[PDB]
Design a protein around this ligand. Structure first.
Ligand SMILES: C[C@@H]1SCc2ncnc(N3CCN(C(=O)[C@H](N)Cc4c[nH]c5ccccc45)CC3)c21
Lengths: 19, 336
């Protein structure tokens, strides 16, 4: 499911701005 | 609405032209706890000694600002924030600098980041997501009418106040611009295609980002995600979006018009401007004036635990606030 793929991914925490 | 914005603009421009400066100093506050963090310093819960009031103190290390090449953007952040005034924007209460750091002291919004509640609860119902979205719509209407682009919409930058309403914080990438602008900045998940493709862009990037925010609020995950930024950009640019099974037809239609690659077609960017969004079926139940007036009952009110409770915020490691006996970057930050 997309939710499972999201939860198993490395981008579920607070995300940093790029510059 | 036209007369409201006209007076708002006179108010904003007087402050834009002669900014507030040096309105407190570090030894007027006792530092309590870190509320949040970043690459160029941090945000602390502080107590102001003479009033007893709590504030969120953003502390930026001038040397780290220079290293990450954010000088002009930091000057933008502070000049803009001291000038604006809208119910859903956090207020800058004081600002100042010392040999080492820049300081922006805001009202402390104790309900925490929308990001925390969103990840914990999983996703927001459409009515809950639309109540937040409506505040962002009115906020971008206000910012854009001052020729400001916001450029960093995301749940991490939205705080939930004691009434359950949103306060937008973090103006690090906000910029006052009448033409096109070119900086590659923002957060990868939220970048409009025209940013990624390096061609110049304008305020419609904020309306694309409102699409991403609404999707993420209502889905619980963003419309474009991958393990690395580069794979995120490939998805945004291809632009194909898939919607959860539970999304309403009205919501999917709004989202196809915000997450629209074609500028001639993206809502908020047409002849009717913001009213294409306000008048969309998804927003039919929204009373736009009642939201502005904070008369709408909020769908969720964070547990309130007294002045200075930080339990709606994560814990962070705590470090000394070092102030050199030598002034750093004095010229560069003269106007701060
Ligand atoms: C600073 C805002 S303004 C009023 C307020 N009240 C409570 N917590 C706050 N936090 C502190 C914790 N935050 C974070 O940790 C972010 N996850 C990272 C961040 C780095 N630099 C920032 C500048 C402004 C807003 C956030 C950040 C965001 C807001 C703030």
């Amino acid at each position: 499911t997309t939710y499972a793929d999201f939860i198993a991914s490395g981008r579920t925490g607070r995300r940093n701005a790029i510059h | 609405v036209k007369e409201f914005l006209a007076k708002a603009k006179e108010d904003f421009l007087k402050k834009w032209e002669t900014p507030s400066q040096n309105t407190a100093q570090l030894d007027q506050f006792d530092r309590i706890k870190t509320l949040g963090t970043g690459s160029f310093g941090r945000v602390m819960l502080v107590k102001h000694k003479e009033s007893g009031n709590h504030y969120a103190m953003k502390i930026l290390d001038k040397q780290k600002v220079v290293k990450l090449k954010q000088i002009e953007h930091t000057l933008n952040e502070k000049r803009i924030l001291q000038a604006v005034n809208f119910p859903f924007l956090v207020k800058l209460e004081f600002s100042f600098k010392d040999n080492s750091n820049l300081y922006m002291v805001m009202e402390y919004v104790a309900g925490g980041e929308m990001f925390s509640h969103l990840r914990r609860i999983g996703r927001f119902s459409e009515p809950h997501a639309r109540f937040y979205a409506a505040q962002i719509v009115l906020t971008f209407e206000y910012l854009h009418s001052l020729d400001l682009i916001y450029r960093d919409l995301k749940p991490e930058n939205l705080l939930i106040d004691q009434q359950g309403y949103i306060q937008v914080t973090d103006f690090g990438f906000a910029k006052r611009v009448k033409g096109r602008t070119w900086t590659l900045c923002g957060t990868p998940e939220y970048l409009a295609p025209e940013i990624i493709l390096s061609k110049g862009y304008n305020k419609a990037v904020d309306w694309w980002a409102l699409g991403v925010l609404i999707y993420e609020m209502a889905a619980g995950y963003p419309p474009f995600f991958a393990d690395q930024p580069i794979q995120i950009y490939e998805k945004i640019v291809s632009g194909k979006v898939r919607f959860p099974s539970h999304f309403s037809s009205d919501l999917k239609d709004l989202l196809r018009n915000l997450l629209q690659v074609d500028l001639t077609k993206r809502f908020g960017n047409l002849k009717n401007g913001v009213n294409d969004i306000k008048n969309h079926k998804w927003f039919a139940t929204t009373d736009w004036i009642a939201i502005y007036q904070r008369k709408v009952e909020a769908p969720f009110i964070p547990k309130f635990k007294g002045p200075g409770d930080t339990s709606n915020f994560d814990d962070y490691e705590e470090e000394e606030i070092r102030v050199s006996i030598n002034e750093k970057c004095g010229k560069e930050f003269t106007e701060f």
